[PDB]
Amino acid sequence: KKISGGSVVEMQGDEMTRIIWELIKEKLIFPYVELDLHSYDLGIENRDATNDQVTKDAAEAIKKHNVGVKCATITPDAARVEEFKLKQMWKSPNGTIRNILGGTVFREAIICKNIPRLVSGWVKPIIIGHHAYGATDFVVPGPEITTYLVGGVAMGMYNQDKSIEDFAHSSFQMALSKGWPLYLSTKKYDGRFKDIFQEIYDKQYKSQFAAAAIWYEHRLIDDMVAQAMKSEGGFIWACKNYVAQGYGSLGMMTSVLVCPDGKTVEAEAAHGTVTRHYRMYQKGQETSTNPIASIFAWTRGLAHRAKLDNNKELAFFANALEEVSIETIEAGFMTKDLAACIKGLPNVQRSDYLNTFEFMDKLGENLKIKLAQAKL
């Protein structure tokens, strides 16, 4: 009999990540877990038909059930307005959900031994989160802020303390959850971030970090980058300042929005819908899309659900699926992007990787085997 999963808020996406989403739901989750799934179709067509209301409804559902799992959606531009005949250029769903829930988005890459990383010395995962908004910029033609005194360009921003307290609480809750030490990086206004972090830490998180064998320290980003390059990793990085690019493969990058209460979490893939692979999929050409980010979104969601419900079966299942993914990649079975991470894209042959459906089938067989091995 399947595990009793619980209440999970599902958010369906677009294009290739939508295909991968249904594949993961049918091959890795539903055959073994029975969920109270609150499905919200965040497709661009459904978003346009409901005037982007389904995104608000889904965010409220995450606020109610404390667990959300999101697929990659389309942030529309003008070309997207033409492609789907949209009634408007809708806002980013991630920004709407992040604004309704609050908290902080944390990104982490999945580590495999045979997949080279940006720095060889890195051994343990490095989780990175940034302070979101939730600032006025105008141009001065020719020759104050209230009252202080400030052609060219003038911009003035205001940041409430509530956002600093939410960022601090989210960082501390994340560090307590993962069990890694927390480091804050900054660069007069920045003098308040350090004092608020230190006060909330000393008053509400000192004995918790001490019991968790972790700690919190403050750094300058100039020191944080250099020290991070010459370290083994294994830490949470709260970055200040005011997607990704080329720091590894995007199929291994995962994202988790964490609310300051420490109970509401949204997991999703850090990459996008992977549009090019979807264009090759529509014409019927062979694709090789990496499903690790979405799978780990599901396993992070089920993991936090198990933590909230104290469901040991669900936690063991999510951890088991993560282990199946990492072990499958380490055994030599991977998509084309990882083989390109190993041998380099020019030297990549067809025998060096599996396509999308072959890799999903491999993960299905290996997950079935590992779950069958749990016979005590």
- Segment near a second copy (CB under 8 A), from 35-43, 153-161, 333-341, 348-356? 153-161
* Contact pattern for ligand 6MX over residues 125 through 164, marking x by CB under 6 A: xx-x------------------------------------
3-state secondary structure of 239: strand
HEC string of 297-328 equals HHHHHHHHHHHHHCCHHHHHHHHHHHHHHHHH
* Contact pattern for ligand NDP over residues 14 through 53, marking x by CB under 6 A: ----------------------------------------
d(CA 354, CA 284): 16
Q: List binders of ligand NDP among 246-285 (CB under 6 A).
A: 250-251, 268, 271-276
Question: How many chain residues are in contact with ligand 6MX, going by CB under 6 A?
Answer: 17
DSSP secondary structure letter of residue 119: S
Look up residue 15 and give its amino acid.
Answer: E
Report the candidate in 40, 127, 64 with the shortest Cα–Cα distance to residue 259.
64
3-state secondary structure of 187: coil
- Give me the least distance between CB of 327 and a second copy, in Å please: 28
Query: How many angstroms separate the first and last alpha carbons of the chain?
Result: 17
Contacting residue, 8, 69, 72, 236, with ligand NDP by CB under 6 A: 72
List, as one string, the DSSP characters of 58-99: HHHHHHHHSEEEE-------HHHHHHHT-SS-PPPHHHHHHH
* Contact partner, 123, from ligand NDP, a second copy, ligand 6MX, none, Cβ < 5-8 Å per class: none
- Give me the least distance between CB of 285 and ligand NDP, in Å please: 12
Binding of ligand NDP by 290 (CB under 6 A): yes
d(CA 65, CA 8): 7
Tell me which residue has its CB nearest to ligand NDP: 272
The H or E element that residue 7 is part of is: strand 3-12
11 and 70 in contact (C-beta within 8 Å)?
yes
Binding of a second copy by 157 (CB under 8 A): yes
Q: List binders of ligand NDP among 229-248 (CB under 6 A).
A: 243
Contacting residue, 5, 6, 76, 248, with ligand 6MX by CB under 6 A: 248
**What letters, b where the CB count within 10 A reaches 16 and e where it falls short, cover 175-197?**
bbbbebbbbbbbeeeeeebeeeb
Q: List binders of ligand NDP among 305-364 (CB under 6 A).
A: 337
Q: List binders of a second copy among 239-278 (CB under 8 A).
A: 244-247
Token representation of residue 302: 């089920």
d(CA 147, CA 306): 52
* Contact pattern for a second copy over residues 207 through 246, marking x by CB under 8 A: -------------x-xx--xx-xx-------------xxx
For a second copy, the closer CB: 150 or 213: 150
For ligand NDP, the closer CB: 136 or 349: 349
Q: List binders of a second copy among 280-309 (CB under 8 A).
A: none
CB atoms within 10 A of CB 357: 15
> Which conformational region is residue 117 in: left (phi greater than 0), alpha (psi within -120 to 50 degrees), or beta?
beta
Contacting residue, 123, 155, 157, 229, with ligand 6MX by CB under 6 A: 229
In terms of Cβ atoms closer than 10 Å to its own Cβ (0-12, 13-18, 19+), residue 265 is buried
Binding of a second copy by 139 (CB under 8 A): yes
User: Across-strand partners of 233?
Assistant: 124
Look up residue 142 and give its amino acid.
Answer: G
Query: Which residues here bind ligand 6MX, judged by CB under 6 A?
Result: 109, 117-118, 122, 125-126, 128, 221-222, 225, 228-229, 239, 241, 244, 247-248
Query: Which residues here bind a second copy, judged by CB under 8 A?
Result: 118, 135-140, 144-146, 148-161, 188-189, 192, 220, 222-223, 226-227, 229-230, 244-247
Query: Which residues here bind ligand NDP, judged by CB under 6 A?
Result: 72-75, 94, 243, 250-251, 268, 271-276, 289-290, 337
